[PDB]
């Protein structure tokens, strides 16, 4: 689809058996999800932005369904104020910015 | 143009006669630039990012070119880690997300 930017570009995702709303975010390198359980190994990471840094858990090789499109990649889990789909998964669904 | 997301979507902007680099960021409602001089009065705004909230200076009706496209609108100035072009200006340049 073509999503305009008049409002926040929010979509439904499926991750870990759960449905969530998330922001399609070209400014985010990585995908960052609010606290939830995911299977497998993880390692700690710090990520930063406006307001400073937060600590997250990095899970690799996680499958997500984004607006009906399946992708796999790393997911960061921690105290983000909104679920963010970053470039590492936007590429896999073929998302582009067009103007 | 059609911009893929394998790398950060960095473009050149021109503001105040000066060229700067900025990130096209669909996850930002507003445009936020690092400390610089802009004309006119400003008003206060608080914005929340991944690590918390920061105070910025809001300047309205500022002339700005984004990847060659002319825009006139609101620019927030403050301690952002990167210059960010948010949805207020992405809509003026006709940008959409496509997949
Ligand atoms: C390593 O992977 C990363 C690293 C950093 C980030 S980031 O979240 O810090 N960020 C990087 C940028 C700053 C280079 C992505 C960015 O899209 C972020 C992504 C983001 C968006 C929202 C909050 C946190 C992070 N948005 C904002 O920081 C942002 C900017 C301006 C404003 C907001 C957010 C504010 N958004 C807001 O409060 O959103 C709600 C109400 C939905 C929570 C509105 C006011 C202002 O217009 C994400 C993944
Ligand atoms: Cl990845
Ligand atoms: Cl591609
Ligand atoms: Na894993």
UniProtKB/TrEMBL annotation, chains A, B:
One GO process term, biological-process aspect: proteolysis
Subcellular location: Host endosome, Host multivesicular body; Virion membrane
Chief site of localization: host cell
Alphabetized Pfam families for the sequence: RVP
InterPro entries linked to this entry: Aspartic_peptidase_AS, Peptidase_A2_cat, Peptidase_aspartic_dom_sf, Retropepsin-like_cat_dom, Retropepsins
MF (Gene Ontology): aspartic-type endopeptidase activity
Gene: pol
Membrane topology summary: Lipid-anchor
UniProt entry tagged with the keyword Iron-sulfur: no
Name of the protein this chain belongs to: Protease
UniProt organism field: Human immunodeficiency virus type 1
